[PDB]
Amino acid sequence: KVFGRCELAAAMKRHGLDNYRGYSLGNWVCAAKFESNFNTQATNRNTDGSTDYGILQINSRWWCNDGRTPGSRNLCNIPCSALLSSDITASVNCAKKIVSDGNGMNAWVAWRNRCKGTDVQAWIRGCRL
Ligand SMILES: [Cl-]
Ligand SMILES: [Cl-]
Numbered sequence: 001k002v003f004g005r006c007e008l009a010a011a012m013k014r015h016g017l018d019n020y021r022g023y024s025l026g027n028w029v030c031a032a033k034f035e036s037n038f039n040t041q042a043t044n045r046n047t048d049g050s051t052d053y054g055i056l057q058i059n060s061r062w063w064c065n066d067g068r069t070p071g072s073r074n075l076c077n078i079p080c081s082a083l084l085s086s087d088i089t090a091s092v093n094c095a096k097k098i099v100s101d102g103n104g105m106n107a108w109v110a111w112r113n114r115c116k117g118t119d120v121q122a123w124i125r126g127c128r129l
């Protein structure tokens with residue numbers, strides 16, 4: 001599923017991401033835009049052989065099991081394919097674990113390089129929330 005901007009904001013808010021660990025909703029919508037273009041089916045292979053999955057591009061070396069990343073942890077205890085569903089629950093629950101591990105949203109490279117320090121509130125402007 002490819003989400004609309006306000007549609008995704010509403011879904012993330014219902015799942016408890018607004019101000020989760022101090023990150024306002026616009027941060028999460030901005031990260032999703034540049035990680036996946038709002039597409040739940042997005043996948044990208046990394047140089048080390050791991051793969052990133054879903055709307056928030058969660059990596060198989062640490063967070064999910066895809067059966068082809070040797071020596072990986074499955075810290076969210078989920079198959080990586082569950083992160084591609086039109087239902088974002090599994091991606092949101094795993095993202096909550098990631099953002100709480102010490103480095104905040106800096107775990108997402110696209111957030112650091114394209115959202116951090118910008119007017120992220122613009123990503124939810126005009127939405128009925
Ligand atoms: Cl915001
Ligand atoms: Cl980047």
Ligand code: NA
Nearest residue numbers: 004005006007
């Ligand atoms: Na929308």
Ligand code: NA
Nearest residue numbers: 060064072073
């Ligand atoms: Na893994």
